[PDB]
């Protein structure tokens, strides 16, 4: 399925995975598009911190759901 | 009056690059990137909005949430500041060719970077990697058994094969007999043990058959994973290594940001940059190497803090809970830097800011891109949160 | 009943305590640890003797020990559940970080509090426009609520 990964900057990019990816896999996703470590990175879905060890379906993140992804964290 | 009497040297020096871009990061902050501010206040309004309270005064509550946001404030994304510096130095249709080349893995002694580094202006793209072993284990069943559902990143010890469940779900052979995973499986049966870590040093193997079994276990999946690839990208740096006259006289100069630690603005405002700078092409390069071959902990501790830390936390950056206990690995990638296009580049950022965001002094610049950030993530509030 | 990691973890909290901080397990659980940490020298919780619990959990020592403060504290990293923003950066928790460790950290905290995000944490928004008061509210806090408290 595809998903939406959107930062600040309003830039978007396209994603494909499935359901059993794990946020690990998907922050390694964005590193082969963006060149950003997957220690580098929050992603964010309605407003809900997705920890590395769960599952896009644990979320229940479905086709052309929109991830936020944070670039400035403190704490 | 000395404006039309003189002029200057027309030729572009690396160092002229080096100094406008830390010039400009340091003043202007996330405006170097080149986003209008009310972007900013837009996306921002929509990750925010859950945050405003829903009763009372709409307008108060919402000038509330504008006025503690930070999102004018630059990323202290590694990753994220290295895609910066080389849109502002290679522009972005270099940048993007950059960003497609091959990371090299960093040698025993670094030779393969020394030997990289022509006497041109040069851009370093660093990426470091960490080792994410497996570090718990699990006595399963193979009726029980499923990759699929299981966890990942993990052994899992069967009566008759042992097996990692790699991060992507891959099962992957340990090379054990199932003569000796029926030993390990049938000796491991106190409950707390069905499901523990591999490396407990608190386990004597002389104590018992299930403590014998487990450091045996342990002893295999160390020797085996060593032939495995679980490298996961943790750090990202840039190095700025400008045309010199002489070998004897070549400088670098590494540019970072720092997950929840420090900007690119605070690495320049403390001059670190500068400080690095002071070890040479060598010396930095062989305690980069260093990072990547020792298997001490307090030697990478140490080394990691003198590199990456911010300015001043060099002896505190990697103690406690930041003890570096995983290896490490060093890649990098190398390009030609053009000083008249960077500048260029520089110059135009600068002609974005001081048309759009005017102002007497930097620190009012940002003031008022900030203001027009806050203004329109308060249109986009006051829109979102008419609806109850 | 425990594995001998827990059981040695626990013996040295008791017999090298860390400096300035009071760990002991629980008479009813094993797993349960009341935590003093006293306020750092020339922080505002000076003076102050703030109590925490400690439980491992089931996975410990493949999990990371839960914390929470159970004195009141005006501190940018703690929220009013009193959890704590730790956390090893840039890697994750492993079996080579033990208990002594956690407690180590928070007591840095206490000298050295790192930002927070302003948004759902107003203590860190004073910290940061307005330090000096903030200062002088942890130090009201510290006196009414970790003081004479043991």
Redesign the interface.
């Known amino acids: 399925m595809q998903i939406f990964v959107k930062t600040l900057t309003g830039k978007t990019i396209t994603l494909e995975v499935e359901p059993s990816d794990t946020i690990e896999n998907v922050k390694a996703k964005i590193q082969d598009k963006e060149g950003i470590p997957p220690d580098q990175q929050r992603l964010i879905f309605a407003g809900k911190q997705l920890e590395d060890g769960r599952t896009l379906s644990d979320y229940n993140i479905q086709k052309e759901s929109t991830l936020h992804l944070v670039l400035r964290l403190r704490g | 009056p000395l404006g039309s009497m003189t002029t200057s040297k027309l030729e572009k020096t690396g160092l002229h690059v080096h100094e406008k871009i830390k010039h400009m990061v340091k003043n202007y902050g996330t405006m170097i990137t080149g986003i209008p501010a009310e972007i900013l206040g837009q996306n921002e309004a929509e990750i925010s909005v859950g945050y405003v309270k829903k009763m009372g005064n709409m307008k108060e509550n919402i000038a509330e949430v504008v006025r503690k946001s930070e999102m004018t404030q630059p990323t202290n994304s590694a990753g994220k500041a290295s895609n910066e510096v080389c849109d502002l130095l290679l522009g972005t249709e270099g940048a993007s060719e950059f960003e497609k080349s091959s990371y090299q893995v960093l040698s025993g002694d670094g030779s393969n970077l020394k030997g990289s580094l022509p006497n041109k202006n040069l851009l370093v793209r660093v990426e470091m990697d960490r080792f994410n072993a497996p570090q718990k284990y699990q006595k399963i069943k193979r009726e029980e058994f499923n990759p699929e559902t299981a966890e990942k990143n993990k052994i899992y010890l069967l009566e008759d094969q042992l097996v990692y469940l790699d991060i992507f779900g891959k099962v992957i052979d340990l090379g054990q007999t199932s003569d000796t995973c029926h030993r390990l499986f049938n000796a491991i049966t106190t409950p707390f043990y069905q499901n523990y870590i591999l490396y407990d040093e608190y386990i004597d193997p002389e104590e018992s058959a299930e403590e014998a079994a487990m450091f045996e276990m342990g002893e295999i999946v160390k020797a085996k994973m060593k032939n495995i690839d679980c490298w996961t990208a943790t750090h990202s740096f840039t190095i700025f290594v400008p045309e010199s006259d002489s070998e004897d006289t070549r400088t670098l100069y590494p540019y970072q940001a720092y997950w929840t630690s420090h900007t690119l603005q605070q690495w320049f405002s403390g001059d670190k940059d500068e400080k690095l700078s002071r070890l040479g092409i060598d010396g930095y390069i062989e305690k980069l190497a260093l990072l990547g071959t020792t298997t001490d902990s307090k030697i990478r501790s140490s080394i990691y803090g003198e590199l990456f830390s911010p300015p001043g936390k060099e002896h505190v950056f990697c103690t406690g809970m930041n003890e570096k206990f995983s290896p490490l690995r060093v890649k990098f990638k190398v390009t030609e830097v053009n000083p008249e296009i960077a500048l260029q580049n520089l110059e135009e950022v600068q002609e974005f800011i001081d048309t759009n965001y005017p102002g007497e002094n930097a620190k009012d610049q940002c003031e008022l891109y900030k203001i027009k950030a806050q203004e329109a993530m308060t249109k986009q509030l006051e829109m979102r949160l008419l609806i109850e | 009943g425990?594995?001998?990691?827990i059981i040695?973890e626990t013996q040295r909290l008791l017999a090298e305590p860390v400096p300035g901080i009071k760990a002991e397990p629980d008479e009813s659980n094993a797993r349960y640890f009341h935590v003093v940490i006293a306020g750092p020298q020339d922080s505002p919780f000076e003076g102050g003797t703030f109590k925490l619990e400690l439980f491992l959990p089931e996975?410990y020592?493949?999990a990371a020990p839960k914390v929470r403060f159970m004195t009141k504290i005006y501190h940018p990293?703690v929220d009013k559940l009193g959890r704590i923003?730790?956390?090893?950066?840039?890697?994750?928790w492993?079996?080579?970080?033990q208990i002594r460790?956690?407690l180590?950290?928070i007591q840095?905290l206490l000298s050295a509090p790192?930002?927070?995000?302003?948004?759902?944490n107003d203590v860190?928004?004073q910290w940061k426009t307005n330090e000096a008061q903030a200062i002088e509210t942890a130090r009201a806090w510290t006196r009414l609520y970790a003081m004479n408290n043991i």
């Open positions: 425990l594995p001998r990691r040695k996975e020592p493949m990293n923003c730790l956390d090893i950066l840039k890697d994750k492993s079996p080579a970080l460790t956690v180590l950290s840095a790192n930002p927070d995000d302003p948004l759902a860190a928004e």
